[PDB]
Amino acid sequence: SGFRKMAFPSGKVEGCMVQVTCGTTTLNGLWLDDVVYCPRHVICTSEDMLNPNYEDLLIRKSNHNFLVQAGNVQLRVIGHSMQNCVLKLKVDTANPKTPKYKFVRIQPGQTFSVLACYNGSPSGVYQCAMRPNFTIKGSFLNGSSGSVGFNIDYDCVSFCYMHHMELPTGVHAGTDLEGNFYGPFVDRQTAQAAGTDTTITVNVLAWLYAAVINGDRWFLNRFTTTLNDFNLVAMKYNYEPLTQDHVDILGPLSAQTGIAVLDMCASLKELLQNGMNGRTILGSALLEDEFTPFDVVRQCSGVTFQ
Amino acid sequence: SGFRKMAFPSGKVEGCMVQVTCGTTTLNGLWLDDVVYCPRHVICTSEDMLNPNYEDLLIRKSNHNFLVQAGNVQLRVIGHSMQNCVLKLKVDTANPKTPKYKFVRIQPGQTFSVLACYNGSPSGVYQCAMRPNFTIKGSFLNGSSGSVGFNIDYDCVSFCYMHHMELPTGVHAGTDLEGNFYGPFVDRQTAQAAGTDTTITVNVLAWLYAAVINGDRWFLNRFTTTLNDFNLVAMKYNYEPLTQDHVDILGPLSAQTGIAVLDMCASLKELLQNGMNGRTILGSALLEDEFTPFDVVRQCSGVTFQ
Amino acid sequence: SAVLQ
C-alpha cells in the first residue's frame, strides 16, 4: 500500500544524455543512435535571444561550432539537422546505448518522468504532470535545458518532453521531441506569461478516491450530480471540465470504493462551493491534482467485492 | 527554480536487480559481484508465515531450489547462507555491471531513494526518509520485497535499506543489507505497531532554507531565538531537539542564504505555535521534513552523479 | 497483523 509520486527508472534515459556546447552556452542533449537532440537556443549568444533570426543564426554556425561531450569522451559533430525548436547534431558514431525509443506528444493531465540533467549527467528523477496551461511544475536551473521527460512501457522509452525555458511565475515550458512547443510559448526572450493555471479535475477526483481508501470520509455526501451540473461549478474555481472519458477512467476506483463517479462529483461540487479549509484529505489541507487515476489504481493495493 | 521531491538516478542500481524464485514465491534480489541478497522469506509458502520456521525451511532448500534470474539469463547458485533476515546466495558469475558499492546502516532522519521492483524488474523510484520509529512512509505492493533503498555518494552506491514487510498502519519496515531490521520489527505476519516518532527538526530547517532560495520568504521574521529556548518549543511539538551538530550541518545552507540558523529557528518556532496561516511553503500545506541538508544542496546546486 | 510483501 501507500501513495507516492513515482518516476520511472531513469537508467535507459541516462545512457542517452550528453553535453552540448556552442560558444559559452552549455546545455544537455539526448543522444539516440547517430543523432543528438538539443534545444535550438544553444546557437544563440547572450544578447542574440531578444529578437532571434534562428534561420539566420544557423547559417552563421559551422560543424566545429558544436561541441558534443558523451560521458568522458568527445564526439565529433559531422553535420547538423534541425526541426522547429530542436537541433539534431549528427555525430560520427551511433549511440550503442540507445534503447527502444519512441517520440510521443502528451496532453495536459498526463504524467511523465523528468531526468534533471546538468552538463550531460543526471541530477535526479521526479514525476511531473502536464498542467492545463501547458507548463510543468518542475525543478530546473540554468544548464538544465535539454533534460527530457519520458515514460517507460514494456521496454520502450516514450520521449514526450524536452526542457527549454522557465517562465517568470516559476513554472517551466518545453517542446516535444520533434521541436514543437507545448502551448503558445516561443524560444525568444520577449513578453511571455504562463496561462491561467487550472486544476486538473480528474486527477483531483482520483485523489479523493484515494483518501477514501485510507479512510477520509467527511467530504462524502448522499447527493448525486450530473456531468453538466458539475462542470457548471467547475468553471468558477479553475477546474478543468470533466469529460465523459474522465468518467470511464475513474471506473476502477468507483468499483472498489462503491462510490459512483457522479457521487464524488457532488462531494467535490460541495467542497468547491464552501472552500472547506482546515480539513485535511490524506493529511493535507489542499486538493492535490498530480496523481492521475492510473497512479492511484496501480498504487492501490486494491481488491473489489462485486 | 522550483523544488520537488527528487530521487537519485537509479541507473547504477537497476543493473543489480535480479528475480529470485523459491518454490512459488517470487521476489527481488540484489546482485552485487557473486552474491545475491534477498529477504529470507522467499523460502516461505502461503501457510507458514504467521510464525515461520526460518532455519528448517532453509534446510530443505538446496542451491537448485533457488531461481536467480537476471533478465534472460539464469544464475547458478553455488552456495547459500542466511545472515539475520537476508539470504546471501553465492552465484558462479560476478555481476559485470556491479557498481562501486558499500553497505551502510542509516540513522533516523537520513533520506534515501527506493528502487521499487517487482519480479526482478525495476518499476519505480522515489525518495523516503528514515522515520525515528524506524518505519518509512513508502509505497510497496506484494512482491516488492527485495527492493532496495540507496544513496549515491562518491560514485559509490550506498545500500541502506531492503524492503521486507508492511505494518498494519500503512507504513513499511525493512532491514539493512546485513539483515538486521530497523526498529523492533520482525519478519512475521503478527500484530506490530509503529512507535512514537518525531518530526525531523533539522530536515524541516533544511526545507525552510530551500524555500528562501526559491523565493518563499513570508515566514521570515525580525526575531532571533536561543538554541535551547527553541528546543523548548520543539520538545512540546514532537520536533526533536536541535543539537550543535544540527546547527553545524545547517551551516552551509546558512552561509549560502545569508540567514543565521537561529533566525530560521525563530521563524520555525511561530510556524509551530501559530500554524501556516492558511499559506503554503514550496507548494505544501504541511511542514515537510524529508529533505536532508545534502538533499537541498544537491537539488539547488544541480549536483549530478555520472 | 503485519504483511510480508
Side-chain angles (χ1 to χ4, degrees), chain A residues 1-153 156-276 278-306, chain B, chain C:
Chain A
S1 67
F3 289 106
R4 300 289 275 131
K5 288 180 278 292
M6 297 185 182
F8 280 101
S10 55
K12 298 186 224 216
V13 174
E14 310 178 15
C16 298
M17 289 305 305
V18 301
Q19 170 175 276
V20 175
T21 304
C22 175
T24 54
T25 293
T26 290
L27 52 85
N28 306 287
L30 189 78
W31 183 22
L32 299 155
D33 281 304
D34 62 312
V35 191
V36 167
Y37 311 82
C38 66
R40 73 161 179 191
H41 76 254
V42 73
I43 53 175
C44 298
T45 72
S46 50
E47 190 52 17
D48 218 327
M49 289 283 282
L50 284 72
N51 174 276
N53 195 348
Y54 272 108
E55 208 80 8
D56 186 72
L57 281 193
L58 203 76
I59 306 168
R60 297 294 201 269
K61 306 282 152 291
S62 300
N63 275 342
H64 48 82
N65 276 100
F66 296 102
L67 320 175
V68 185
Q69 210 201 28
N72 265 18
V73 188
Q74 287 264 34
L75 296 191
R76 193 189 207 270
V77 171
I78 62 168
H80 41 294
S81 187
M82 169 184 75
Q83 197 182 7
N84 313 296
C85 295
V86 295
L87 283 175
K88 293 174 209 225
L89 300 173
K90 297 295 180 293
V91 290
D92 63 5
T93 53
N95 189 2
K97 297 173 287 295
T98 316
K100 297 294 181 64
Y101 85 115
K102 195 236 183 171
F103 282 178
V104 306
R105 187 172 169 101
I106 74 162
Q107 304 101 26
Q110 301 212 257
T111 54
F112 59 96
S113 290
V114 188
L115 179 57
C117 290
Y118 298 94
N119 300 117
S121 295
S123 198
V125 66
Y126 49 81
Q127 199 57 7
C128 282
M130 194 72 211
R131 310 293 307 164
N133 62 357
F134 289 108
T135 68
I136 77 165
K137 288 178 187 301
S139 179
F140 295 97
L141 311 162
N142 284 335
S144 45
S145 282
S147 300
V148 286
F150 67 102
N151 296 291
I152 299 169
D153 204 3
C156 188
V157 176
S158 286
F159 290 113
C160 61
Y161 181 77
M162 189 167 217
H163 190 249
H164 274 235
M165 60 196 213
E166 184 187 63
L167 313 177
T169 75
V171 294
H172 309 90
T175 68
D176 62 26
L177 269 299
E178 320 200 14
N180 298 297
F181 262 101
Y182 291 107
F185 318 117
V186 300
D187 56 351
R188 325 185 280 122
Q189 275 189 9
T190 49
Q192 286 177 132
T196 313
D197 201 13
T198 311
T199 314
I200 302 173
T201 304
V202 61
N203 289 5
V204 160
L205 276 167
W207 189 241
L208 285 171
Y209 269 116
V212 164
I213 289 155
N214 258 300
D216 284 294
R217 295 271 181 291
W218 55 269
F219 49 87
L220 303 160
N221 54 26
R222 303 160 42 253
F223 304 183
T224 192
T225 292
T226 45
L227 197 46
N228 310 98
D229 186 38
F230 180 79
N231 280 359
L232 297 185
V233 168
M235 287 87 75
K236 318 179 180 219
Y237 311 91
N238 290 323
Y239 270 62
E240 288 290 320
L242 197 77
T243 53
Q244 177 66 24
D245 188 33
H246 294 154
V247 160
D248 193 1
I249 290 173
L250 303 151
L253 301 178
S254 168
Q256 170 181 1
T257 70
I259 300 151
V261 172
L262 289 182
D263 190 359
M264 288 303 297
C265 283
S267 310
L268 183 55
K269 175 187 168 187
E270 194 202 32
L271 285 182
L272 297 186
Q273 270 162 345
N274 306 337
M276 186 89 203
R279 308 323 312 163
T280 64
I281 307 93
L282 278 166
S284 181
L286 63 85
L287 293 165
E288 160 59 29
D289 66 340
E290 273 186 10
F291 274 35
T292 77
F294 317 112
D295 305 88
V296 180
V297 172
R298 299 180 195 193
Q299 299 191 8
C300 289
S301 183
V303 162
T304 311
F305 287 100
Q306 329 197 273
Chain B
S1 67
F3 195 89
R4 310 300 308 281
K5 289 75 62 172
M6 185 207 282
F8 279 103
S10 51
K12 290 169 218 323
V13 186
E14 288 164 60
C16 307
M17 308 302 324
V18 290
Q19 158 185 342
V20 174
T21 311
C22 182
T24 53
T25 310
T26 311
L27 56 82
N28 313 271
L30 185 62
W31 186 25
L32 296 165
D33 278 316
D34 57 326
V35 180
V36 167
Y37 308 77
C38 63
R40 72 169 170 183
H41 59 256
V42 70
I43 68 179
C44 306
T45 77
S46 304
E47 184 80 9
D48 185 20
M49 45 186 202
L50 205 67
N51 191 343
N53 218 24
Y54 274 112
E55 157 51 16
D56 275 327
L57 276 176
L58 194 54
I59 295 190
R60 307 186 192 133
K61 307 297 187 181
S62 307
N63 302 333
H64 68 276
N65 302 84
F66 298 104
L67 261 289
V68 184
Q69 209 184 323
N72 270 340
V73 304
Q74 197 207 349
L75 307 185
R76 217 173 314 263
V77 177
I78 73 181
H80 59 284
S81 68
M82 174 174 125
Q83 167 194 32
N84 310 307
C85 283
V86 305
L87 287 193
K88 294 185 192 293
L89 299 160
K90 195 196 280 186
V91 299
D92 70 0
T93 306
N95 190 343
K97 274 278 262 273
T98 184
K100 312 205 255 214
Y101 74 105
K102 71 186 201 176
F103 290 166
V104 59
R105 174 155 190 105
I106 66 187
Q107 279 258 23
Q110 292 196 7
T111 59
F112 51 81
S113 289
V114 176
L115 182 54
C117 301
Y118 298 93
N119 313 118
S121 300
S123 186
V125 56
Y126 60 101
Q127 193 96 345
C128 288
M130 186 51 149
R131 309 299 313 180
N133 65 355
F134 304 111
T135 71
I136 63 165
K137 182 68 187 67
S139 163
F140 304 102
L141 301 173
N142 306 109
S144 54
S145 286
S147 304
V148 291
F150 68 95
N151 276 273
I152 284 152
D153 212 328
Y154 285 92
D155 207 347
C156 186
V157 173
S158 299
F159 291 100
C160 59
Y161 176 84
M162 179 165 248
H163 180 44
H164 268 73
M165 72 200 182
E166 185 176 279
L167 302 191
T169 74
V171 295
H172 302 104
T175 81
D176 57 23
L177 265 293
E178 284 168 34
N180 266 290
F181 265 72
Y182 291 97
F185 316 123
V186 54
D187 53 332
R188 199 173 312 128
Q189 299 196 342
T190 70
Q192 321 197 12
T196 179
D197 78 18
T198 320
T199 305
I200 321 173
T201 317
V202 64
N203 276 6
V204 180
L205 279 178
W207 180 64
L208 286 185
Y209 274 114
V212 173
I213 293 152
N214 273 273
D216 275 326
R217 69 205 299 147
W218 56 264
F219 47 96
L220 292 185
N221 52 26
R222 212 162 63 255
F223 292 4
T224 318
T225 179
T226 76
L227 174 66
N228 81 93
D229 205 334
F230 166 76
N231 268 9
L232 201 184
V233 178
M235 297 304 299
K236 185 198 281 172
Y237 270 93
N238 258 329
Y239 277 61
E240 78 279 354
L242 205 72
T243 180
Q244 185 51 226
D245 306 332
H246 293 147
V247 169
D248 302 339
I249 298 98
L250 286 154
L253 278 179
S254 172
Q256 213 180 303
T257 75
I259 305 188
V261 172
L262 293 181
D263 283 309
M264 281 294 175
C265 285
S267 300
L268 178 53
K269 193 196 291 176
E270 56 166 352
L271 273 167
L272 304 170
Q273 289 168 326
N274 270 31
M276 308 180 72
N277 300 134
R279 311 181 75 165
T280 43
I281 283 164
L282 289 176
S284 293
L286 292 85
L287 290 183
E288 197 53 57
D289 71 341
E290 276 163 330
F291 292 107
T292 68
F294 185 72
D295 289 353
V296 167
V297 160
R298 81 157 163 143
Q299 169 165 183
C300 288
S301 303
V303 186
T304 70
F305 319 96
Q306 187 70 26
Chain C
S1 59
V3 160
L4 266 171
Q5 319 195 281

